[PDB]
Design a protein around this ligand. Structure first.
Ligand SMILES: *[C@](O)(C(=O)NCc1ccccc1)[C@H](C[C@@H]1CCNC1=O)NC(=O)[C@H](CC(C)C)NC(=O)/C=C/c1ccccc1
Length: 300
């Protein structure tokens, strides 16, 4: 029992994080093989005014880099620029490099953030990429370069995020490991305004299934709405569309409650809980994916 937003264990990733200094700017990088990936704004002469990156890159000198792993120096051999990241070739290889790939997130995907400062991990937490290509994180000065990841069943680490931006709203943006900034935000300290966040319908359906399976059923209306009607309502009320009903077949069978009944309940519960709670939450929750709910109720 219970449902809790968790991180996948962080050990394999903790050994990949390094301190990258250029001039007096310090942030984090990710050390895999003999390459350190970091946000390209580390070579900006200032990050408080518009940055001419071509100029900053062509004026850059290697000797201004200082890359270190836990206080141990790491020599810089070369630097290339790829979208919003640098790939810094270094003279030592990371012998703790895990089996890994690079992967780009899509909205609705869960992943893990290892929040780091000056090459050191301080925190780990699960988050979702929102429809507006932001996340809601917790980062202060120094967090840039913190990696996001997922761990596949076989132990393969998918590196999928690199922290870069805090929007004027406080929401957070990164790039992937190719240097594409999520949502095509720009890696500039200019005002950029994200689209309005859409509640992830698929996750809210999962959440309600989790509530049924934990004995919380008071909110259940005896109403049904189909996917097409729900999707139309969702446009008007800040929700995404819902995917295939069949994705939920194991949970529909275990609870006896169809998706369509959950879709109606979301419509009704959107009006508020009336001072009551579901699994302790005072409004609908779109934090958990179906995969997370299944893993936390059954996944062994
Ligand atoms: C990131 O550069 C970082 O951690 N840098 C190291 C560092 C910065 C400052 C002092 C010491 C060390 C930060 C991370 C931000 C900072 C606060 N919380 C975070 O997540 N990233 C930035 O400062 C961004 C740099 C850009 C060049 C990409 N700044 C912005 O995203 C600014 C946005 C903005 C400016 C003006 C009006 C609205 C929005």
């Amino acid at each position: 029992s219970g449902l809790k937003k968790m991180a996948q264990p962080s050990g394999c990733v903790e050994r990949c994080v390094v301190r990258v200094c250029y001039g007096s700017t310090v942030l984090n990088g990710v050390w895999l093989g003999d390459t350190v990936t970091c946000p390209r704004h580390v070579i900006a002469p200032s990050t408080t005014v518009l940055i001419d990156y071509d100029h900053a890159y062509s004026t850059m000198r290697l000797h201004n880099f200082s890359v270190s792993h836990n206080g141990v120096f790491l020599g810089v051999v070369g630097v290339t620029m790829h979208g919003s990241v640098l790939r810094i070739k270094v003279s030592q290889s990371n012998v703790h490099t895990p089996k890994h790939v690079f992967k780009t997130l899509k909205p609705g995907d869960s992943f893990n953030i290892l929040a780091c400062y000056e090459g050191i991990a301080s925190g780990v937490f699960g988050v979702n990429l929102r429809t507006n290509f932001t996340i809601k994180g917790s980062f202060i000065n120094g967090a840039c370069g913190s990696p996001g990841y997922n761990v596949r069943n076989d132990g393969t680490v998918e590196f999928c995020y690199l922290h870069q931006i805090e929007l004027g709203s406080g929401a957070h943006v990164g790039s992937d490991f190719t240097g594409s900034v999520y949502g095509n935000f720009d890696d500039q300290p200019s005002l950029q305004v994200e689209s309005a966040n859409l509640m992830l319908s698929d996750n809210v359906v999962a959440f309600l299934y989790a509530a049924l399976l934990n004995g919380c059923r008071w909110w259940l209306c005896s109403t049904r709405v189909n996917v097409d009607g729900f999707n139309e309502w969702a446009m008007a009320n800040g929700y995404t569309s819902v995917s295939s009903v069949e994705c939920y077949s194991i949970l529909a069978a275990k609870t006896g409650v169809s998706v369509e009944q959950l879709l109606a309940s979301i419509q009704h519960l959107h009006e508020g809980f009336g001072g009551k709670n579901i699994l302790g939450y005072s409004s609908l929750c779109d934090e958990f994916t179906l995969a997370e709910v299944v893993k936390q109720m059954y996944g062994v």
